[PDB]
Amino acid sequence: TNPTAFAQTTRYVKDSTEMRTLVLNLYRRYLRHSRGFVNNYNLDIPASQVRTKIRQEFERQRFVKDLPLKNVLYMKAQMEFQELVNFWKQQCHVMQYFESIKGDSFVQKFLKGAQ
Amino acid sequence: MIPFEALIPYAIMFAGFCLGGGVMNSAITADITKRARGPNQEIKRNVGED
Amino acid sequence: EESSESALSKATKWYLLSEIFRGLYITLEMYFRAPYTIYYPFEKGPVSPRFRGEH
Amino acid sequence: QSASTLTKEDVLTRSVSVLRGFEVKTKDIDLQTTFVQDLGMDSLDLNDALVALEEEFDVVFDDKTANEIKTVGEVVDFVLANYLPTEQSINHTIR
Amino acid sequence: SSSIQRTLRNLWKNGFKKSFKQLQGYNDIKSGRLVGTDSFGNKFYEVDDPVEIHMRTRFVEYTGFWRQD
Amino acid sequence: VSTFPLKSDINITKSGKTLLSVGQGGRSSRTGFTATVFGGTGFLGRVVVSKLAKHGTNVVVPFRNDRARRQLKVNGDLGVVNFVEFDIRNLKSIEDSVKYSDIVINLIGTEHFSKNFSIEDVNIGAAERIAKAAKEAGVSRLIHVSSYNANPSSSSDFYATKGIGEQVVRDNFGPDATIVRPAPMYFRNSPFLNELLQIKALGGNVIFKKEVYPVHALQVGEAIERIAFDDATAGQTYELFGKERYSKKELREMIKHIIHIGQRGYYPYSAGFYLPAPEPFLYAFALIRQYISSQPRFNVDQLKRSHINQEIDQSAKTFTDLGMVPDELSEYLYRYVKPHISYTSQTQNRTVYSKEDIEKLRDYVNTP
Amino acid sequence: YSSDLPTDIPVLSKRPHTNLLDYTFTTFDKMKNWARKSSFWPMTFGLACCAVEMMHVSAPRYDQDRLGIIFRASPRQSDIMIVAGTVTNKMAPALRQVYDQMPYPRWVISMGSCANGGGYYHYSYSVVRGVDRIVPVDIYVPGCPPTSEALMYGVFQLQKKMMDGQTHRMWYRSY
Amino acid sequence: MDLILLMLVAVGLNIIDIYIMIEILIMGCTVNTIYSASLDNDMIGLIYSLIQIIIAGVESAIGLSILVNYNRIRNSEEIE
Amino acid sequence: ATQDLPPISGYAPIQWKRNLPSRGFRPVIWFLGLCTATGYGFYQISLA
Amino acid sequence: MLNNLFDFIEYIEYWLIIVAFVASVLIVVAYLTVAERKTMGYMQRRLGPNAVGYYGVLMAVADALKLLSKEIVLPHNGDIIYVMSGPLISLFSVLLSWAVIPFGPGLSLLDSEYSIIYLLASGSIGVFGTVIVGWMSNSKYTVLATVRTTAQLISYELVLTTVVFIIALIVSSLNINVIIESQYNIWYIIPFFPLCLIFFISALAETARPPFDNVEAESELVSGHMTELSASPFVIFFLSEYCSMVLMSTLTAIFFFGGYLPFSNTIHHLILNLFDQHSIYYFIIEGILLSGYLAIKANFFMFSFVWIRAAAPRLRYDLLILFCWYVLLPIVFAIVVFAPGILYCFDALPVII
Ligand SMILES: NC(=O)C1=CN([C@@H]2O[C@H](COP(=O)(O)OP(=O)(O)OC[C@H]3O[C@@H](n4cnc5c(N)ncnc54)[C@H](OP(=O)(O)O)[C@@H]3O)[C@@H](O)[C@H]2O)C=CC1
Ligand SMILES: CCCCCCCCCCCC(=O)OC[C@H](COP(=O)(O)OCC[N+](C)(C)C)OC(=O)CCCCCCCCCCC
Ligand SMILES: CCCCCCCCCCCC(=O)OC[C@H](COP(=O)(O)OCC[N+](C)(C)C)OC(=O)CCCCCCCCCCC
Ligand SMILES: CCCCCCCCCCCC(=O)OC[C@H](COP(=O)(O)OCC[N+](C)(C)C)OC(=O)CCCCCCCCCCC
Ligand code: SF4
């Protein structure tokens, strides 16, 4: 058998320096394919907004220290990339991904039953 | 056991051909014979007794 | 060279579609048998006392 | 046809404009201008610039080069040596 | 069970009025012995015809002429 | 939208009922309210009914078209959406719709007339009848949606009947009736944008010169939701319009570039994009199709309204009185004309017009 | 700009025929309703064990083809959508897209407990609790699975509702 | 209009569009042969017309194969 | 008596082995008839 | 009135003759769709349509009326040119091919010495109209079906054309009526039994009928070129495909079973001797009789179209290409040399008379 397009073999990285390079390479691939994401998924936003969204997700995991968490985060980030480029995700899922987003006071929540 | 219900559409298809042939053979032959009777309408349509 | 049929025997079954014509004949036999269809809702398929339906 | 028409002055000029649209410390960009020191780009800003410079020149930096790039002049050198016009259909050339 | 002899035989037994009703809802002209009639008015019949197939020995006549529920 | 459209879990209606809410606001939740949306199968009713049913408000949708109402049931959970076969010439059916509702929303209104109903029957006769039937049934809140240029003394038979309908709603239901005056509404399958997106628009040199303040249909549907669930909005008139003023000539030309019909220098002129005609011909053709065509075409009264521009009543309340910011057509124009773009289909690269790009295109359109 | 509206005119489904045009558009409606009921072309959308019973309706014992029922592969040639099987979250967008591509008039039949409300898999993380959360449903056929006769009865109910359509008399008397 | 070479605008911008022009141009010669042969009641002209049609179809196939192989050369990697 | 059981003598044996016996003439005969028909056909065409 | 009314019928008479000709062909095509399901149903031990009209006689009417009452799917109202031009070319091609079919001696709308060429030329246009549906279309199943239509056309076109040319060579004429009348003493089924099989095999491939239904393979390409077609564009293509089945069945009866010639000359004379030839009723009966002979033979081959569909599985089109080019073409080109050699040996080269 052969792997699908844009598939990477799973490997457990044991070097933080080597892990950092692999993350930066993948981050570039997300930016390069940003215009492809707008084309395939027929998004209503420019590719510039897509690249901004990509950076935010990479900035969330900027300060993760543990190496085992880095590998699982990296592996899951590769799977998502292979999913987007190959057009396996349905267009509704990608549209809702950009649909994501001031908290009320104590009394405001108290009046409506709070959470 | 001959299924007569299955043979009904073939009977209508058979009558489809017979409709075309029955009309074409008679309508065309009559018109050719009618127009061969004479040089005007009073001879083509009317039939003399003699 | 180790076949049991002559060249003309195998070519006659081949060119004249021997087994294809047999399959047509088997199909034509079914044309003269009683069909299985029942006329729902005027007729109902068999049911058993163990049947599970509306509560 | 299938050959580059790039000069060192044009590639530098187009590189400076694409780098000017970012949030850099200084707008005075030359070949010796470093990304980390002079312009002040962290890990993510640098790769945003590289992809931006990719789209401008229709080139793709290799992973080995991109991780090790320091100066603006290195980018201009890379574009001049690696740029190729994209292949056209069988009708664009002969017709 | 699909022959025209069976249909003409059943057509003669039922009469035109009953057979035309079967020609409108049943799609098949059929005859049988009256077995009963329920409280809604349906008439239930059983067939002694030797050429009837297994699951077709019992059938209903509905009260309506255009729709049967 | 939001996650819970209420400021509290208890709401006492002005009719005296106390309605409690259960759940966090999903499909399985309830708000305790029963609402009746007249004209729910229409363009705006589908927006309004969807917003009410998604949060658990029981919606009674009186219908005359059996096929058009089927898609409304998907909006709410089991038992939330209810249908009543009705006619404005039938009084028993109208009472049955409002018999249990605490809120009645009236979206019934036409710009045309037909063999069975005139503009006076619908924009006045129906509105008056529904308001009175609502009052006899003890409905706490009535919401009536007129047009943007409602005026009892207007030259347009649509603007006049809409203006009179505002008066009769208050004269029957009382001073507490709420009135909404939406501007031309843009959305998917929007009647406002549909005529601009049509190719063979005859007599556009006259029809498309009207200026308006178009407003997002989702906000108009959102505003009505705010009004029904806030009793401080009773007896008030709301003018719901966008901040920017557009003329249909500008939008018609802006749309042309987004649809890329101008990619060919000949095709728009050959395909009938421009169909100039003298106004008397536009009058005769509109008059003729009023007694020959069976489908509502551009009628005589819409020809008159093409000259009248939208006038904002300054004494009425706006979106800011409801604590909402109006949307901008520049930020929504592309995605609603996106279905009509010819080739698209990831051919080479989509031209996604951002909010900034739409305004840049508007200047280019206005440049001679 | 005065008006005067009648008060006791019955609804369309209960309005009798008064003049000649009431009979003319009723005849126009009946012929079109007769054809659509007669040419009942469902779309092949068998998802799970409820599809086996749908295949047995086409089997010689029941032979839906004798009623004019033909299964079409493409949504363009179909006017009935029979949801026979569990609708999962991974399948729901595909199901909605397939439904949206049917030209009107279109009807939807929901067959079996999975499509009706989730059934055995109601409390599953990957199951839609009823196909009527995604598409409008005209009739619900119960059972796990519904028998072939139970499905045929559901079709007969839909054909009965289709024969009551008054689309062209609606234009005459309601518009 | 002919002397300013208006026909150069009517020919499409693909190599296959040049092939169609050649077929149309040759077909003009055959129509002229058929027209003259019929007026003269001469079967030698119609024999000529038949020869032109067969020969014109031969070069259409030979030219197509060259264009077919030309496109194959571009799609030569064929790593699949 | 209270359970479904096979008869004391058991059930008669059934047929389960393949039963598709060959039918028709030998291929030589079919070829000869084809040549016989072709020869007679062209004889009538020749006469006409 | 009177005289003006009577000779106005004479002014419109031939149009009614054409309307009756069109009506007769459409009745067979409409009820072939019913007959196929009835024939397949009983072979499959079901009934087939018997609930739409009395015993199922209105099933064809319901299918057309329901499809004619459906919305047409297209991106825009002005995009009718895309998915309507193809169906019309296919329908006009097969309908024009019926102009040369004689229901009796001289009863063809078009009679000419090149009726055979017109028949082959007209049907070749229908092949073009089918491929137009995949006009740079974004539907991959329509695109995949267009490729297979061309592959099948290359397969059958040479064999079907050459077979008809051998029949025309035996009579030395390209007039269809002359070919029918040349079969008085012998039906070409006996001298050319191999060619009748090859003609029918070619007809199955031309009409995209199973076992050569690789174009509209439901299990492979959902609906083939019809996957995007709904309402009127679907009826026209469906109507033209079943018109082609009737045409090729009637051509099988013409080229090999004597066309309209009677099965029994003795019985044909017995039936016609009851009617006076000086009365118009003789020519009605003769027209019914001769067309009945053609109808009976064509009904059997329309039955055979349904019969082969219910017995044989589908064959891949790449195997169809090898079958037509390696097997059928060498055999047919052998007979095109065989037949003139036999006739010359016995001094029986054909002439037109
Ligand atoms: N750009 C816009 O759309 C504007 C809207 N408005 C007003 O907002 C309201 C909502 O209209 P909208 O949804 O946008 O588009 P619609 O034209 O679909 O609104 C008409 C609604 O009222 C119903 N209706 C009309 N006449 C009758 C009648 N005799 N009997 C029963 N029902 C009738 C219709 O029922 P059915 O669906 O069954 O036909 C429909 O639901 C209208 O009253 C309109 O005048 C005013 C300014 C701008
Ligand atoms: C008359 C015109 C119509 C039919 C023309 C063509 C018929 C077949 C010719 C080739 C036969 C062949 O090649 O024969 C080869 C085979 C058998 O030979 P085997 O395998 O060695 O037998 C083994 C040894 N035995 C000889 C002891 C049995 O025969 C067949 O399978 C004959 C099948 C015919 C039955 C169906 C008849 C109706 C078909 C449908 C018609 C519309
Ligand atoms: C011109 C274009 C081509 C022709 C197209 C023809 C298509 C076929 C027509 C559709 C059939 C249809 O509609 O008949 C089916 C309908 C459906 O009845 P239902 O809905 O169940 O209610 C009816 C039953 N009730 C009311 C008790 C519940 O029966 C009818 O009501 C038929 C009754 C009227 C019969 C009048 C006959 C007058 C003579 C006509 C012949 C000269
Ligand atoms: C000279 C006298 C000429 C005889 C005239 C007839 C010629 C026919 C040639 C057939 C050859 C063949 O069937 O070829 C088979 C080819 C390829 O098969 P293959 O891959 O080579 O395997 C077979 C080779 N073996 C067995 C030696 C290993 O494809 C097929 O399966 C074609 C199937 C055609 C069926 C069409 C149905 C028609 C029904 C007709 C009802 C009226
Ligand atoms: S409802 Fe029952 S039979 Fe139907 S798909 Fe679900 S589990 Fe299977």
Side-chain angles (χ1 to χ4, degrees), chain C residues 5 9 12-14 16-19 21-22 24-25, chain I residues 22-27 30, chain J residues 193 197 300 307:
Chain C
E5 287 192 15
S9 302
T12 303
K13 299 185 193 179
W14 195 62
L16 292 184
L17 313 166
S18 68
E19 86 280 11
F21 278 115
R22 169 154 177 159
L24 288 172
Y25 193 95
Chain I
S22 60
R23 195 66 183 274
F25 291 134
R26 289 181 289 177
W30 297 100
Chain J
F193 185 77
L197 294 177
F300 170 73
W307 193 4

Side-chain angles (χ1 to χ4, degrees), chain A residues 11-13 19 67-76:
Chain A
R11 178 173 59 95
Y12 193 81
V13 190
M19 169 61 65
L67 188 65
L69 289 176
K70 292 177 182 178
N71 275 279
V72 184
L73 282 180
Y74 171 80
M75 184 195 57
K76 294 188 174 192

Side-chain angles (χ1 to χ4, degrees), chain H residues 13-54:
Chain H
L13 293 172
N14 297 285
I15 299 180
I16 187 60
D17 313 341
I18 291 292
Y19 280 41
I20 285 158
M21 179 204 62
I22 295 178
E23 298 185 18
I24 297 180
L25 285 178
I26 292 178
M27 183 161 53
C29 301
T30 304
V31 175
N32 203 308
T33 309
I34 299 168
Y35 142 86
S36 303
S38 70
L39 282 185
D40 290 6
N41 182 26
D42 173 43
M43 299 298 100
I44 308 301
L46 297 186
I47 294 168
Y48 197 14
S49 297
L50 175 57
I51 290 177
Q52 298 173 33
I53 292 179
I54 299 182

Side-chain angles (χ1 to χ4, degrees), chain A residues 38-40 42-46 87 111-114, chain F residues 4 6-9 335 338 346 348-350 352 354:
Chain A
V38 184
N39 298 335
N40 294 336
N42 195 14
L43 304 177
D44 305 324
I45 60 183
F87 210 162
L111 292 172
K112 65 201 304 175
Chain F
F4 186 58
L6 293 173
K7 207 72 67 62
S8 59
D9 42 341
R335 77 188 51 168
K338 187 182 61 180
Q346 56 171 144
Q348 26 79 31
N349 176 24
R350 292 184 184 269
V352 175
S354 64

Side-chain angles (χ1 to χ4, degrees), chain C residues 31-46, chain E residues 1-2 25-28 30 53 55-56 58-62 68:
Chain C
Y31 191 79
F32 301 92
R33 298 187 193 174
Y36 295 107
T37 305
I38 60 183
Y39 289 65
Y40 187 86
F42 298 91
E43 303 152 1
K44 248 221 166 190
Chain E
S1 142
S2 64
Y26 205 162
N27 329 281
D28 184 23
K30 204 168 183 171
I53 66 174
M55 315 294 191
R56 298 188 66 197
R58 301 177 182 174
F59 67 99
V60 192
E61 178 176 7
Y62 292 92
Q68 314 86 19

Side-chain angles (χ1 to χ4, degrees), chain F residues 45-62:
Chain F
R46 300 171 187 184
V47 177
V48 172
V49 169
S50 177
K51 289 191 174 298
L52 293 184
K54 64 187 293 180
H55 294 306
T57 303
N58 292 283
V59 181
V60 178
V61 196

